Amino acid sequence: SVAALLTVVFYIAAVMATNLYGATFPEWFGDLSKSLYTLFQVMTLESWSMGIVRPVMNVHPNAWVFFIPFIMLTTFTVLNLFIGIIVDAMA
Amino acid sequence: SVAALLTVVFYIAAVMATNLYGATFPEWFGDLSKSLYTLFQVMTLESWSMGIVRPVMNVHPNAWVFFIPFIMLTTFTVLNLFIGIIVDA
Amino acid sequence: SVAALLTVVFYIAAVMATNLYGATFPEWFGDLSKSLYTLFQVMTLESWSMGIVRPVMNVHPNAWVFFIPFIMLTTFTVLNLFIGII
Amino acid sequence: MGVGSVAALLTVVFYIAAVMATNLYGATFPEWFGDLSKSLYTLFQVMTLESWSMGIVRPVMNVHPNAWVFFIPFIMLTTFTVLNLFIGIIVDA
Known part of the structure; x- marks a missing residue:
C-alpha cells in the first residue's frame, strides 16, 4: 500500500519535472523515463x-x-x- | 516536538555561517537563504x-x-x- | 545468516557485471575483483x-x-x- | 554508558585507524593523511x-x-x- 503510494509520488513528480526542466535539461529530464532515473x-x-x-x-x-x-x-x-x-x- | 527544535538549530547555524563564511563563499553562504540551502x-x-x-x-x-x-x-x-x-x- | 546470501548475491552480480561491462569499462569491471570493488x-x-x-x-x-x-x-x-x- | 562506552569504543577505533592511515598513506597523500588531525577529518x-x-x-x-x-x-x-x-x-x- 505504501510502495504504491511512493510509486504514485514518483510518477507525479516525474511528469512534473519533465514538463518543468526537460527543455533546459534534456540529459536529466527531457523524458519521463529520464526524469524517473534522475528522481531516483x-x-x-x-x-x-x-x-x-x-x-x-x-x-x-x-x-x-x-x-x-x-x-x-x-x-x-x-x-x-x-x-x-x-x-x-x-x- | 523535535521538528521545531531542529528548525531552531538550522536557523542558528544559518545565521552563524552567513556571518562566518558569506564574505569568502557568497555562492554558498552569502545569504541567510543560501546558508539554509547549503546547510540542508x-x-x-x-x-x-x-x-x-x-x-x-x-x-x-x-x-x-x-x-x-x-x-x-x-x-x-x-x-x-x-x-x-x-x-x- | 543474511550475510551468507548477500555474499552469494554480490558474487552473482560481480560475475554478471564483469562479463557485461568489463570490455568497455575495465577500470571498474574488467576483473571479478574490480567488479567486487565497484559493486560495493x-x-x-x-x-x-x-x-x-x-x-x-x-x-x-x-x-x-x-x-x-x-x-x-x-x-x-x-x-x-x-x-x-x- | 554504552551508548557512552560504545561511543568511547568508536573514538578508540577512529584513533587506531587515524594513527594507522597517517603512517600508511601520509607520505603519498599528505593533504588527506599527512597529519593525525588530517587523517581524523578524512576518516570521518x-x-x-x-x-x-x-x-x-x-x-x-x-x-x-x-x-x-x-x-x-x-x-x-x-x-x-x-x-x-x-x-x-x-x-x-
Whole structure:
C-alpha cells in the first residue's frame, strides 16, 4: 500500500519535472523515463545538490522548492517503509 | 516536538555561517537563504566534505569545528525524529 | 545468516557485471575483483549514478535495469542484516 | 554508558585507524593523511561515506593498490557501530 503510494509520488513528480526542466535539461529530464532515473538518484541523495539541483537553479532559481520537499517526502516514506519491514520481522 | 527544535538549530547555524563564511563563499553562504540551502545539503551529507567543508578550510582552516558538530547534531536529531515518529505507529 | 546470501548475491552480480561491462569499462569491471570493488561502492551509494551508472549508460543504455535492482536488493538486505543483529 | 562506552569504543577505533592511515598513506597523500588531525577529518568523511570511493579510496589505490583492505573494513566497522548506537536508541524508546 505504501510502495504504491511512493510509486504514485514518483510518477507525479516525474511528469512534473519533465514538463518543468526537460527543455533546459534534456540529459536529466527531457523524458519521463529520464526524469524517473534522475528522481531516483535524488532519492538515494547521490549528487542531488552539487550535481543536479544547484546546476538547475542556475537557470530556474528557486527550483529548490520542487526538490527539497521531494527529498523530504521520498526520504520520509522510505524511512517508514524500512522501519515496518524491520519492526514487523522482529514482532 | 523535535521538528521545531531542529528548525531552531538550522536557523542558528544559518545565521552563524552567513556571518562566518558569506564574505569568502557568497555562492554558498552569502545569504541567510543560501546558508539554509547549503546547510540542508550538508545535512543530507551530499558533497559536504569534498564539495563544501574542504574548500572552506583552504580559506578558514579548522572550520570543521563548526561543520562536524553541525553534522552530529542534525544527523542525531533526524535519527531521533525518525525513531520517535516510527516506534509510535 | 543474511550475510551468507548477500555474499552469494554480490558474487552473482560481480560475475554478471564483469562479463557485461568489463570490455568497455575495465577500470571498474574488467576483473571479478574490480567488479567486487565497484559493486560495493554502488551499495554504499557513493557516486553510483553520476560516477558509474550514468557513464555506463552512454555505452550500454538501459544498464540501469542491472543497477537499480542491484541497489534495491543490496539496500533491502542491509536493513534485514541491521535488524539481523538486533 | 554504552551508548557512552560504545561511543568511547568508536573514538578508540577512529584513533587506531587515524594513527594507522597517517603512517600508511601520509607520505603519498599528505593533504588527506599527512597529519593525525588530517587523517581524523578524512576518516570521518569516509565514515559519512561522502566521496569515500571516487574521492579517496580509488585515488589511494592508484599508489598503493589493495588499500581497500584498510578502507572497506573500516567502513563495515564504523557503519555497524553507528547502527549499534542507532538501535541503542531504536528499542531504547
